[PDB]
Structures are given as C-alpha cells and as structure tokens.
C-alpha cells in the first residue's frame, strides 16, 4: 500500500503491427500482448516483448488504465 505512483507493470495491447526499426525498439503484431514498465517518452515506452527488453511506440499500442488483467 501507499507504495507510489508508477509501480507494477502495465499490460498493453498492440494497436497496429509494428516492427522495431532498431535493436532498442521491439517488433510486435497487432493484438500481441506487451508489458510496460516505464514511459520512456511521450511517444515511447519501456517494457518487454516475447522476452525482449526495449522500447514500445505509443501509436501502435493501447495503454490500459486498469489495475490488473481484464478477462474477456
């Protein structure tokens, strides 16, 4: 409790098929489940994909503002 503001990871869903142009970024496909750890920038994110830590675009993903997974 009263831990902080940015703690546990955020489960985001790929908005559109994206391919990490560089090693830093990550390549995913619309629908693919992506985990978020921290917002690298206003147009980027910092999480992991298929076991790969890198950057994630905010234009090809939907940052869910819900605590925990949403069954269904």
mmCIF file of N, CA and C in Angstrom:
data_model
loop_
_atom_site.group_PDB
_atom_site.id
_atom_site.type_symbol
_atom_site.label_atom_id
_atom_site.label_comp_id
_atom_site.label_asym_id
_atom_site.label_seq_id
_atom_site.Cartn_x
_atom_site.Cartn_y
_atom_site.Cartn_z
ATOM 1 N N UNK A 1 0.806 -1.206 0.000
ATOM 2 C CA UNK A 1 0.000 0.000 0.000
ATOM 3 C C UNK A 1 0.843 1.260 0.000
ATOM 4 N N UNK A 2 0.214 2.390 -0.310
ATOM 5 C CA UNK A 2 0.916 3.668 -0.351
ATOM 6 C C UNK A 2 2.346 3.487 -0.849
ATOM 7 N N UNK A 3 2.507 2.658 -1.876
ATOM 8 C CA UNK A 3 3.824 2.395 -2.446
ATOM 9 C C UNK A 3 4.322 3.598 -3.241
ATOM 10 N N UNK A 4 3.565 3.977 -4.267
ATOM 11 C CA UNK A 4 3.946 5.110 -5.091
ATOM 12 C C UNK A 4 2.963 5.363 -6.217
ATOM 13 N N UNK A 5 3.463 5.896 -7.328
ATOM 14 C CA UNK A 5 2.619 6.191 -8.480
ATOM 15 C C UNK A 5 2.852 5.180 -9.598
ATOM 16 N N UNK A 6 4.107 5.045 -10.015
ATOM 17 C CA UNK A 6 4.464 4.116 -11.079
ATOM 18 C C UNK A 6 5.134 2.869 -10.510
ATOM 19 N N UNK A 7 4.346 1.818 -10.310
ATOM 20 C CA UNK A 7 4.880 0.581 -9.772
ATOM 21 C C UNK A 7 4.720 -0.584 -10.729
ATOM 22 N N UNK A 8 3.870 -1.538 -10.361
ATOM 23 C CA UNK A 8 3.631 -2.710 -11.194
ATOM 24 C C UNK A 8 3.580 -2.327 -12.670
ATOM 25 N N UNK A 9 3.868 -3.303 -13.544
ATOM 26 C CA UNK A 9 3.861 -3.094 -14.996
ATOM 27 C C UNK A 9 2.454 -2.882 -15.544
ATOM 28 N N UNK A 10 2.370 -2.318 -16.744
ATOM 29 C CA UNK A 10 1.083 -2.064 -17.380
ATOM 30 C C UNK A 10 0.902 -2.933 -18.619
ATOM 31 N N UNK A 11 -0.144 -3.754 -18.612
ATOM 32 C CA UNK A 11 -0.430 -4.637 -19.736
ATOM 33 C C UNK A 11 -1.053 -3.861 -20.893
ATOM 34 N N UNK A 12 -0.307 -3.735 -21.985
ATOM 35 C CA UNK A 12 -0.786 -3.019 -23.160
ATOM 36 C C UNK A 12 -0.948 -3.960 -24.349
ATOM 37 N N UNK A 13 -1.893 -3.639 -25.226
ATOM 38 C CA UNK A 13 -2.148 -4.457 -26.406
ATOM 39 C C UNK A 13 -1.726 -3.730 -27.680
ATOM 40 N N UNK A 14 -1.046 -4.450 -28.566
ATOM 41 C CA UNK A 14 -0.588 -3.876 -29.825
ATOM 42 C C UNK A 14 -1.750 -3.272 -30.607
ATOM 43 N N UNK A 15 -1.636 -1.986 -30.927
ATOM 44 C CA UNK A 15 -2.676 -1.289 -31.674
ATOM 45 C C UNK A 15 -2.557 -1.573 -33.168
ATOM 46 N N UNK A 16 -1.323 -1.697 -33.645
ATOM 47 C CA UNK A 16 -1.074 -1.970 -35.056
ATOM 48 C C UNK A 16 0.282 -2.645 -35.247
ATOM 49 N N UNK A 17 0.345 -3.571 -36.197
ATOM 50 C CA UNK A 17 1.581 -4.291 -36.482
ATOM 51 C C UNK A 17 2.767 -3.334 -36.539
ATOM 52 N N UNK A 18 3.693 -3.490 -35.600
ATOM 53 C CA UNK A 18 4.874 -2.637 -35.542
ATOM 54 C C UNK A 18 6.151 -3.473 -35.534
ATOM 55 N N UNK A 19 7.205 -2.937 -36.140
ATOM 56 C CA UNK A 19 8.486 -3.631 -36.202
ATOM 57 C C UNK A 19 9.625 -2.724 -35.749
ATOM 58 N N UNK A 20 10.226 -3.061 -34.612
ATOM 59 C CA UNK A 20 11.322 -2.268 -34.090
ATOM 60 C C UNK A 20 12.378 -1.977 -35.137
ATOM 61 N N UNK A 21 12.407 -0.738 -35.618
ATOM 62 C CA UNK A 21 13.373 -0.335 -36.633
ATOM 63 C C UNK A 21 14.798 -0.631 -36.174
ATOM 64 N N UNK A 22 15.066 -0.384 -34.895
ATOM 65 C CA UNK A 22 16.389 -0.623 -34.332
ATOM 66 C C UNK A 22 16.336 -1.676 -33.232
ATOM 67 N N UNK A 23 17.505 -2.167 -32.832
ATOM 68 C CA UNK A 23 17.591 -3.177 -31.784
ATOM 69 C C UNK A 23 16.872 -2.720 -30.519
ATOM 70 N N UNK A 24 17.060 -1.454 -30.163
ATOM 71 C CA UNK A 24 16.430 -0.893 -28.973
ATOM 72 C C UNK A 24 14.926 -1.148 -28.984
ATOM 73 N N UNK A 25 14.272 -0.759 -30.074
ATOM 74 C CA UNK A 25 12.832 -0.945 -30.208
ATOM 75 C C UNK A 25 12.475 -2.428 -30.236
ATOM 76 N N UNK A 26 11.180 -2.718 -30.301
ATOM 77 C CA UNK A 26 10.705 -4.097 -30.334
ATOM 78 C C UNK A 26 9.702 -4.300 -31.466
ATOM 79 N N UNK A 27 9.735 -5.482 -32.074
ATOM 80 C CA UNK A 27 8.830 -5.801 -33.171
ATOM 81 C C UNK A 27 7.681 -6.680 -32.689
ATOM 82 N N UNK A 28 6.456 -6.199 -32.878
ATOM 83 C CA UNK A 28 5.271 -6.938 -32.462
ATOM 84 C C UNK A 28 4.177 -6.854 -33.522
ATOM 85 N N UNK A 29 3.091 -7.587 -33.302
ATOM 86 C CA UNK A 29 1.972 -7.597 -34.237
ATOM 87 C C UNK A 29 0.666 -7.255 -33.525
ATOM 88 N N UNK A 30 -0.175 -6.468 -34.187
ATOM 89 C CA UNK A 30 -1.458 -6.070 -33.620
ATOM 90 C C UNK A 30 -2.091 -7.221 -32.845
ATOM 91 N N UNK A 31 -2.432 -6.964 -31.586
ATOM 92 C CA UNK A 31 -3.044 -7.989 -30.759
ATOM 93 C C UNK A 31 -2.067 -8.599 -29.775
ATOM 94 N N UNK A 32 -0.809 -8.719 -30.188
ATOM 95 C CA UNK A 32 0.225 -9.289 -29.333
ATOM 96 C C UNK A 32 0.266 -8.589 -27.979
ATOM 97 N N UNK A 33 0.345 -9.379 -26.913
ATOM 98 C CA UNK A 33 0.387 -8.834 -25.561
ATOM 99 C C UNK A 33 1.769 -8.272 -25.243
ATOM 100 N N UNK A 34 1.805 -7.017 -24.809
ATOM 101 C CA UNK A 34 3.063 -6.361 -24.471
ATOM 102 C C UNK A 34 3.019 -5.797 -23.054
ATOM 103 N N UNK A 35 4.111 -5.975 -22.318
ATOM 104 C CA UNK A 35 4.198 -5.482 -20.948
ATOM 105 C C UNK A 35 4.961 -4.163 -20.891
ATOM 106 N N UNK A 36 4.473 -3.237 -20.073
ATOM 107 C CA UNK A 36 5.110 -1.933 -19.926
ATOM 108 C C UNK A 36 5.660 -1.753 -18.515
ATOM 109 N N UNK A 37 6.846 -1.163 -18.419
ATOM 110 C CA UNK A 37 7.483 -0.932 -17.128
ATOM 111 C C UNK A 37 7.522 0.558 -16.799
ATOM 112 N N UNK A 38 7.920 1.362 -17.778
ATOM 113 C CA UNK A 38 8.002 2.807 -17.594
ATOM 114 C C UNK A 38 7.888 3.534 -18.930
ATOM 115 N N UNK A 39 7.350 4.748 -18.893
ATOM 116 C CA UNK A 39 7.183 5.546 -20.102
ATOM 117 C C UNK A 39 8.487 6.245 -20.476
ATOM 118 N N UNK A 40 9.200 5.678 -21.444
ATOM 119 C CA UNK A 40 10.464 6.247 -21.896
ATOM 120 C C UNK A 40 10.285 7.694 -22.346
ATOM 121 N N UNK A 41 9.196 7.956 -23.059
ATOM 122 C CA UNK A 41 8.911 9.298 -23.554
ATOM 123 C C UNK A 41 7.426 9.458 -23.868
ATOM 124 N N UNK A 42 7.046 10.652 -24.308
ATOM 125 C CA UNK A 42 5.656 10.936 -24.645
ATOM 126 C C UNK A 42 5.234 10.172 -25.896
ATOM 127 N N UNK A 43 6.215 9.648 -26.622
ATOM 128 C CA UNK A 43 5.946 8.893 -27.841
ATOM 129 C C UNK A 43 6.686 7.560 -27.830
ATOM 130 N N UNK A 44 7.047 7.100 -26.638
ATOM 131 C CA UNK A 44 7.762 5.837 -26.490
ATOM 132 C C UNK A 44 7.513 5.228 -25.115
ATOM 133 N N UNK A 45 7.804 3.938 -24.982
ATOM 134 C CA UNK A 45 7.611 3.238 -23.717
ATOM 135 C C UNK A 45 8.779 2.300 -23.433
ATOM 136 N N UNK A 46 8.868 1.834 -22.190
ATOM 137 C CA UNK A 46 9.939 0.929 -21.791
ATOM 138 C C UNK A 46 9.372 -0.337 -21.153
ATOM 139 N N UNK A 47 9.353 -1.422 -21.922
ATOM 140 C CA UNK A 47 8.834 -2.680 -21.417
ATOM 141 C C UNK A 47 9.544 -3.880 -22.011
ATOM 142 N N UNK A 48 8.858 -5.018 -22.036
ATOM 143 C CA UNK A 48 9.431 -6.244 -22.579
ATOM 144 C C UNK A 48 8.464 -6.913 -23.551
ATOM 145 N N UNK A 49 9.014 -7.612 -24.538
ATOM 146 C CA UNK A 49 8.200 -8.299 -25.535
ATOM 147 C C UNK A 49 8.800 -9.658 -25.883
ATOM 148 N N UNK A 50 7.968 -10.695 -25.844
ATOM 149 C CA UNK A 50 8.418 -12.047 -26.155
ATOM 150 C C UNK A 50 9.788 -12.319 -25.542
ATOM 151 N N UNK A 51 10.041 -11.720 -24.382
ATOM 152 C CA UNK A 51 11.314 -11.911 -23.712
ATOM 153 C C UNK A 51 12.398 -10.999 -24.254
ATOM 154 N N UNK A 52 12.011 -9.790 -24.645
ATOM 155 C CA UNK A 52 12.958 -8.823 -25.186
ATOM 156 C C UNK A 52 12.699 -7.428 -24.627
ATOM 157 N N UNK A 53 13.671 -6.902 -23.890
ATOM 158 C CA UNK A 53 13.550 -5.574 -23.299
ATOM 159 C C UNK A 53 13.964 -4.496 -24.298
ATOM 160 N N UNK A 54 13.073 -3.535 -24.525
ATOM 161 C CA UNK A 54 13.363 -2.462 -25.457
ATOM 162 C C UNK A 54 12.378 -1.315 -25.346
ATOM 163 N N UNK A 55 12.113 -0.654 -26.467
ATOM 164 C CA UNK A 55 11.183 0.470 -26.490
ATOM 165 C C UNK A 55 9.885 0.089 -27.194
ATOM 166 N N UNK A 56 8.798 0.756 -26.823
ATOM 167 C CA UNK A 56 7.496 0.488 -27.421
ATOM 168 C C UNK A 56 6.779 1.787 -27.778
ATOM 169 N N UNK A 57 6.312 1.878 -29.033
ATOM 170 C CA UNK A 57 5.599 3.059 -29.527
ATOM 171 C C UNK A 57 4.217 3.209 -28.897
ATOM 172 N N UNK A 58 3.812 4.452 -28.658
ATOM 173 C CA UNK A 58 2.512 4.730 -28.061
ATOM 174 C C UNK A 58 1.442 4.892 -29.137
ATOM 175 N N UNK A 59 1.862 4.826 -30.396
ATOM 176 C CA UNK A 59 0.940 4.968 -31.517
ATOM 177 C C UNK A 59 0.505 3.603 -32.040
ATOM 178 N N UNK A 60 1.206 2.560 -31.610
ATOM 179 C CA UNK A 60 0.893 1.201 -32.036
ATOM 180 C C UNK A 60 0.568 0.315 -30.838
ATOM 181 N N UNK A 61 -0.020 0.915 -29.809
ATOM 182 C CA UNK A 61 -0.385 0.181 -28.604
ATOM 183 C C UNK A 61 -1.439 0.933 -27.799
ATOM 184 N N UNK A 62 -2.231 0.191 -27.030
ATOM 185 C CA UNK A 62 -3.277 0.788 -26.208
ATOM 186 C C UNK A 62 -2.983 0.602 -24.724
ATOM 187 N N UNK A 63 -2.441 1.642 -24.099
ATOM 188 C CA UNK A 63 -2.113 1.594 -22.679
ATOM 189 C C UNK A 63 -3.375 1.504 -21.827
ATOM 190 N N UNK A 64 -3.653 0.307 -21.318
ATOM 191 C CA UNK A 64 -4.831 0.088 -20.486
ATOM 192 C C UNK A 64 -4.658 0.736 -19.117
ATOM 193 N N UNK A 65 -5.632 1.553 -18.728
ATOM 194 C CA UNK A 65 -5.588 2.235 -17.440
ATOM 195 C C UNK A 65 -6.380 1.464 -16.389
ATOM 196 N N UNK A 66 -6.230 0.143 -16.393
ATOM 197 C CA UNK A 66 -6.933 -0.710 -15.443
ATOM 198 C C UNK A 66 -5.953 -1.533 -14.614
ATOM 199 N N UNK A 67 -6.203 -1.605 -13.310
ATOM 200 C CA UNK A 67 -5.341 -2.358 -12.408
ATOM 201 C C UNK A 67 -5.512 -3.860 -12.620
ATOM 202 N N UNK A 68 -4.496 -4.488 -13.205
ATOM 203 C CA UNK A 68 -4.552 -5.916 -13.456
ATOM 204 C C UNK A 68 -5.143 -6.244 -14.813
ATOM 205 N N UNK A 69 -5.131 -7.536 -15.172
ATOM 206 C CA UNK A 69 -5.664 -8.007 -16.453
ATOM 207 C C UNK A 69 -7.184 -7.900 -16.522
ATOM 208 N N UNK A 70 -7.709 -7.773 -17.737
ATOM 209 C CA UNK A 70 -9.149 -7.658 -17.939
ATOM 210 C C UNK A 70 -9.685 -8.856 -18.716
ATOM 211 N N UNK A 71 -10.006 -9.926 -17.995
ATOM 212 C CA UNK A 71 -10.526 -11.139 -18.616
ATOM 213 C C UNK A 71 -11.633 -10.807 -19.613
ATOM 214 N N UNK A 72 -11.617 -11.487 -20.754
ATOM 215 C CA UNK A 72 -12.623 -11.252 -21.773
ATOM 216 C C UNK A 72 -12.158 -10.272 -22.832
#
